[PDB]
Amino acid sequence: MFEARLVQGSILKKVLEALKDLINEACWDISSSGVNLQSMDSSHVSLVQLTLRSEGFDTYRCDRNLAMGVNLTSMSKILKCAGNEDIITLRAEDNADTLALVFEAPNQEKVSDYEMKLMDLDVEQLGIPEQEYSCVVKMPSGEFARICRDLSHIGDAVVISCAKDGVKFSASGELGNGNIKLSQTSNVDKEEEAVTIEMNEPVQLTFALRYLNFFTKATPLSSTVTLSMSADVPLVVEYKIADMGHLKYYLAPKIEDEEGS
Amino acid sequence: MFEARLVQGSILKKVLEALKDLINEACWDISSSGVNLQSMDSSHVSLVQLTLRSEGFDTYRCDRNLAMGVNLTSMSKILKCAGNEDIITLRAEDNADTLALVFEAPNQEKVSDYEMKLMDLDVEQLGIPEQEYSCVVKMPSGEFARICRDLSHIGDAVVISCAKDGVKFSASGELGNGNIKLSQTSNVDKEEEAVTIEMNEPVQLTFALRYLNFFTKATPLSSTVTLSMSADVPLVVEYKIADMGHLKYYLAPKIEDEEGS
Amino acid sequence: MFEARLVQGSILKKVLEALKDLINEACWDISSSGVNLQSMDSSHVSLVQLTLRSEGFDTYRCDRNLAMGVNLTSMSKILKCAGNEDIITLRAEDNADTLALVFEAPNQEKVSDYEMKLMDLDVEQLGIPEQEYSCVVKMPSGEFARICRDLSHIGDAVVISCAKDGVKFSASGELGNGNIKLSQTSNVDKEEEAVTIEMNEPVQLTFALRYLNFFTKATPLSSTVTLSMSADVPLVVEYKIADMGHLKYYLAPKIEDEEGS
Amino acid sequence: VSALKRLERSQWTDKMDLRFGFERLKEPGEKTGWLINMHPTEILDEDKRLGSAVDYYFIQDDGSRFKVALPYKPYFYIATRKGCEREVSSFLSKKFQGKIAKVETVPKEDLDLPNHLVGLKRNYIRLSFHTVEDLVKVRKEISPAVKKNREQDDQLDNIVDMREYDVPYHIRLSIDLKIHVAHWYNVRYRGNAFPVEITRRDDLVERPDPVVLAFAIATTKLPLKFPDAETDQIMMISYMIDGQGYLITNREIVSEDIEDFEFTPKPEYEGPFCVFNEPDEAHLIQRWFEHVQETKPTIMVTYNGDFFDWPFVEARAAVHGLSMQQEIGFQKDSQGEYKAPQCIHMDCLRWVKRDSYLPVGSHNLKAAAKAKLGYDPVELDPEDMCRMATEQPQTLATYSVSDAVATYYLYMKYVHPFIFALCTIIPMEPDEVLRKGSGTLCEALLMVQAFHANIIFPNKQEQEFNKLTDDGHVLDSETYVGGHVEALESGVFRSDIPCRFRMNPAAFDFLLQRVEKTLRHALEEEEKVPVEQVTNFEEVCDEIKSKLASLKDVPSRIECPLIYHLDVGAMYPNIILTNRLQPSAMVDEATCAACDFNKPGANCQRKMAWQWRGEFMPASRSEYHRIQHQLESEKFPPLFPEGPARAFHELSREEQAKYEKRRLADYCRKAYKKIHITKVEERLTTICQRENSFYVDTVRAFRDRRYEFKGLHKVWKKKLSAAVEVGDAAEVKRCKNMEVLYDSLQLAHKCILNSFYGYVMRKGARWYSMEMAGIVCFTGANIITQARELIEQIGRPLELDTDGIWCVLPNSFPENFVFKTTNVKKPKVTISYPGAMLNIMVKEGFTNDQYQELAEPSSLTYVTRSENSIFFEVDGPYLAMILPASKEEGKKLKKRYAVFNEDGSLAELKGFEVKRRGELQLIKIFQSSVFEAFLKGSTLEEVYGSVAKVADYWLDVLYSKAANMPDSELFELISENRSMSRKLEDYGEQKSTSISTAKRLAEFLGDQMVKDAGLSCRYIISRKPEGSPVTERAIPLAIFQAEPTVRKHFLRKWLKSSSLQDFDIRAILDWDYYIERLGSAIQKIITIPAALQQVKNPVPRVKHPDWLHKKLLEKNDVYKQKKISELFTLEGRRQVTM
DNA sequence: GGTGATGCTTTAGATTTTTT
DNA sequence: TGAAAAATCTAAAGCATCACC
Ligand code: SF4
């Protein structure tokens, strides 16, 4: 017998809104530490880790390590149905092939319990170790999404630099090109707009800008983002989701092998 | 010669956009006691009932009973021009086949009269019998619209049941099934947003949500709506509008054929 | 070393989005008095004359009359792609074929620069004459956009007639016919809801609505739109870009020379 | 062309004529012959005047051959105003002295003259020249100014219009002198001054055998490109002469010598050989050329030799010190063809392309060999043979001589009798007939028939650009209604399974009320047998009444169906015969009023409508005037490179029309939001039934001649069977020759009859009328639609065809009957009842009653008769019929089905084994296997279970891995071969996939594959570069067999991956796209038709489309719907009025 | 809390090649 | 000899979302 409750259920709707397009199939993992998800995307180029600990749910009960069989594009249709102020109370019996989540209105007049059947699958699990990275930028989430949409409109690829004067987002396409400079902001102490960059050494590395703008749609779940980037290392696009969890992104860099040399 | 005038031009826009999607050609029945519509859709599943009494109009006069047939899609398409506030005047002639729509500025600056030429048609007109209905429930239009759009994403069958605690909205499909229970609101200061139920005999009967979604877009007509049903009879959904009249839709049930055993 | 810094970037974005679907490519003439745009569209029936004066620019520095040939689509998607509240600046080289743009945020947080190529073209600047027009009318942009989208939505051609009572817009079609008449008011001290009529000689002439919609797509550029016409001279849809420039439009009369039947 | 060059040209061709067994007949004497070739040459007469002529080449029955020159002064007709013929004729006589020789007034019947039936003729002026270049000179002098003057509406302006300028010279001789190929002649000669006379002989008809040759080219090449004429060497020419084979081999490339070997595929065929090995290529070419000199043929044959053999050998002869013209006689003409002054060149590919009625993608060889000859020749792909020529030459020699014998017998068995049956009626040379299309063949027949009726020939019409229909709206399409080709329902219909039916008792009452009349009509019209002597009429009427009543009393049954093919053979010619349509007879009311036969109560008019479809710009006429006036003061780029500025007024019509159309299209695509508007309106026109009947008379003559020749072919076929049952060589040879002659004439008449309808719609035709094709197609549509209304009433139709209906009928419905007849010649009569039913329907519906003919021209008396040859002939009850289904709503697959013979073989199969473009070789074997194994089964569920089981083989092999079975044939199991004609550079604008894999292979071996064209384009689609579209994941198999380190490096570089270590070919491939392709095939063939006919999924591994899935969910659910019509009581009906 | 307005998604229509 | 099956570009229309009175 497993169940959970959430006072602000809009975060689950928002994370499903983010994940409905990057991932089509992913096997949820339910443990006593909380809920976590480890899977590889549709194009097998990026693997996402989700983690919401036990304190995020005000009422959490998980007597055994059990895994769901959810497909994401299906229940993303039925999770978007709630309002922005509803209450989500998920439930799942252990021997059941189907979990039922019950909805509660903000002023307590109605209940909307929906159950979604699951197919049981098995996907390999890998644990990426933690490593100290050369650069970590405290870029606002809104500005990061804006600059991703800006650069993706010209070309298909972007190179990221972290020089001593700031970070450099430049993209070059067949039609135009340009570079964007984000100077450090220390005159304002508020972290919602100011940027502070961890400075070790400048790194030049190319990422798939189309896919970056593809999963930048997760923007409103966190107020600010941190781009952790090292040489020949997949970048860690971190979102501090609400105030209890995190959203781990790993996109593998691409290296061009031109025939000139 | 026929004359009509609405003190609020928004209600005519709302009825045209409510009846836009369901039928294509309509047949206005114009009488001194009021104007009515009894047109029938092409799928022969739903019928539209419309009532607009004479005393609601600022000026209203009819020399005799008039029956003219208009292309209702183009009617809503031309009425979408008019603003949400401007005074709408309807002008007709017994020796002409053209209906006129004069729009008046709130501060007396602009006039806009339009001429629409009508056409003949052969449609069925169906007499509706009056019977007492077993279960009657009134419900705010916004949350019922939300319920209908919610259950449209589950499947194509909705089950309307009336239990002791209130009305229950079921919906099955390939994605499992989903239920929406509602309770009784008694200690409420305002009945405009409240729900109340009366019973004669519980009954379960299924409907298709395509036409119900077609009815859903009459929500801005008024904040309240009442739906009632009984044994093998359609719904009556009264979107009564500011004592000008009301608007009703009739949707075919189906008897519960044996499938469980 | 062509440099042109302007403390607002919204007006350039608006006047450039004006030429989105009207002129695909044009010549950008630079002179000590400012910048000009004379260009024929793909269908070679309408005309555009944009002038942005030098004194209106915050800081301006040009050295020699230089003409570019950049296509409107590329620069328009570049400029609309970036931000709107920021400050724009121009940068050019004496012999290069590439413009440069600078987007400096007012809060001194980020800078954003793009630079794109062009194509060389030197079409002749048409020496259009200026003649005294039969009538001059000044009306707000919003209601003019409303009536133009109306009459493109309901018909195909409009007959614009000006008299002492105001201006009328008579449009017909296969669905019906109607007209919109406007009356001048003078008791209103503000021009946001006031219209003015200059009465010298009445004239009736027929135009096309697709081109009117294409022109009046530029409605956020100015709060007022002025029109002027003669017996055979095209319209002048003159705009007032703040207190910095003006953007005109021209439409040849729709001759029909139909049989007398 | 200067005369000071054409004189030695004619001397050179005379010498070549002398050295190839031909000799110009000089001795005055009468000798029999056989015309085989016409060639327009120059013949200097006895008075040193340049004179154009023709060269009638003949062969004889003894082997000796000769030629005769006929000098006939060419001409064309010009037409001038009335009362001014003699003045313009005299002015032309005194203006072109030395060019114009004879001019006279000649009355000839113009075909479009107003009021022309009662005997009005327009006087014409015919002028004659000496040489063809003088015709060209005077034509180019006079034609353009006068045609501009006439279309605008010195004394040369009085003429109006000239005719038959486009008629070639040899066709003009073959018309005026009645000299057709493949006829026996008696040629008589007197001297140089006396003109030579030629007469036709008909008391014997037996065709001789001209000396024939047929050679094929096999060549190597550098790997994966189109072979060139300078990099590789010819090594084996294999050629056939009169059933005896000779092979000449270059010993430098092949390994060792070659010995004689018999090559017989079947006992009918003979493949004897006497091979010859030569040291070097120069000696091979010399020996082949000298052996051609020794044999001296008039006819010889290549298979695609115009584009593959002769340019190659001509180039190599030119490089290696020779020139190809002066030793054999074949050279390139301006039209890109290879004609010889002394030899006729045959290309079997043109015959297969035009007349063999094969699927389009089976036009290449081995397909006309497995379809027409009956055997599969031994083959190997051109990549392997380059390496094969090094070690053993047995397989290479076998392939080369197999290609040679296939070409030779393909020509001799089928192409030779067919083409020499066309030439008896077509007034053109045999290579001219086989070269170009059916349009000019029909044009030549109408030419000869019009000349016998003394009718002027209309000019090839100007293709009028930018035509305005009513209120401007210039058109880019001027088309009639398309053919009604559909497929009413999908699935299986076997003659054993029970099937659903839905009778209409009113239809059976209607059919019951008139059984006697239908049998009257069947006995009286179908076989021309009077009915008053049949004995068992009452018995068969009682039988059919019993069957019809016993089927009527229960109008709802589930019984075994009988598949029929209710088609009308030669349907469109039958329509044009019954309705009597001629392409210059149909005249609008603007001229029938001027006709003096416009009398009330007459029957000169027949009204038939048609559906005209017109697609045009939405710009009105005033917009067109504005845009042409505005396009008057602008510059244009020059047509030629490095040219001057071009204005608008001096532009030609074609380029200015194209540019104005482009300007209107660009003005439209942004302004009026609708680029194209398709409008269909009914148009009714009057077809004059009182006309000088040459067209419909010709069609009637060919239909009667076809039936006559079919009868003589049948009687000579039974003579042939008796002859092979008795066994005497001379009489079996004679009867075989006559049987082949009659069969070839039958096929020739059938092909011409089929092509009359197709000719008239073609652009530029002399007798052009789009109303023709519209009217005939719409009448055929009307007949087909009334037929399918009746078949819908009585049973169910299955497929809609331009002239055929497929249907299933209950087995208790009568099929055929037998009659006892007292006639000694015809004692047994059989009539199929559905044929009689359709025949009486079309007899009461579509019989012409205004069908009028001439009786005698003196008294103008016209006999009005009534004819209707429109006949629904029927086919036997087929075993099964299959209709595969489409994947989308609204559109149903057109002409994609399969019909099975009674014995279990293939009756017809269309739309599937066409291979029109390159295919994957992954769905063809699947569909062949399912069609072959499909028959076994009892019910619907059993046959779908069997086809699902045989499909599970391919689904398990493709969906799982290759597994235990070997990997040798997997590469060709998926590989798709593609090729291009032009270079890689000029295709660089587009991306596509073919040039993409060309560039992918260019980075592997080198840029040498860029500088050429036509290389390998293997399409093993890769998997691991995911996200990228298929256009970038196209890799070839050239890297699989290369060096190991090279393929490791290139597999790491190409597919943007470095960490992966598996480089096996069994992991690179993308199984998902292959499964998608095979699954789409199985949706088309099996699964969707299974779900349509109320049967669940035959295989569970394929997912239905969304529309079919939701249809099945709403259907299988016990909750269908309810209505309001029966749930609430209807009040009444009133209608809105004025 | 509604409402004009806009980026995003879907979906039907225009375009373009080849079959040597 | 073409001309239409299939892929690919492309713009119109609906929908949830965003800021303001
Ligand atoms: S249709 Fe009648 S009137 Fe017209 S040309 Fe023929 S015969 Fe004369």
Numbering used by the authors:
A (entry chain C), B (entry chain D), C (entry chain B): 1 to 261
D (entry chain A): 29 to 181, 213 to 1197
Which of the paper's sentences describe this entry?
Replicative polymerases (Pol), such as the leading-strand polymeraseε (Polε) and lagging-strand Polδ, synthesize DNA with extraordinarily high fidelity. The high accuracy is achieved by their 3′-5′ exonuclease activity, which correct errors when they are made by the DNA polymerase (pol). The POLE1 NTD harbors both DNA polymerase and 3′-5′ proofreading exonuclease (Exo) activities and is therefore referred to as Polε-core in this study. Polε-core interacts with the ring-shaped PCNA sliding clamp to assemble the holoenzyme.
The second intermediate is in a Pol-backtracking state. In this state, the EM density of the T/P DNA substrate is weaker and frayed such that the unwinding has started. Because the unwound primer 3′ mismatch is at the entry of the channel leading toward the exo site, this state represents the Polε-backtracking state in which initial melting has allowed the primer 3′-end to move away from the pol and toward the exo site. Further, the thumb, along with the dsDNA region, has moved away from the P-domain to facilitate the T/P fraying. Superimposition of the Polε-core backtracking and mismatch-locking states reveals that the P-domain and the α/β subdomain of the thumb move away from the dsDNA region by 3.6 Å and 6.8 Å, respectively. The larger space between the P-domain and the thumb allows a longitudinal movement of the T/P by 1 bp in the backtracking state. The mismatched primer 3′-end moves about 15 Å from the locking to backtracking state, and the primer ends in these two states are separated by a three-helix wedge in the Exo domain. Importantly, Arg-975 appears to directly contribute to the T/P fraying by forming an H-bond with the template T-1 base, which enables the mismatched primer 3′-end to flip toward the exo site in the Pol-backtracking state. The dsDNA region inside PCNA slides down by 1 bp from the mismatch-locking to the backtracking state, and the dsDNA region inside the Polε-core tilts 20° toward the thumb domain, which moves away by ~9 Å to accommodate the new DNA location. Overall, the thumb and the anchor loop drive the T/P transition from the locking to backtracking state.
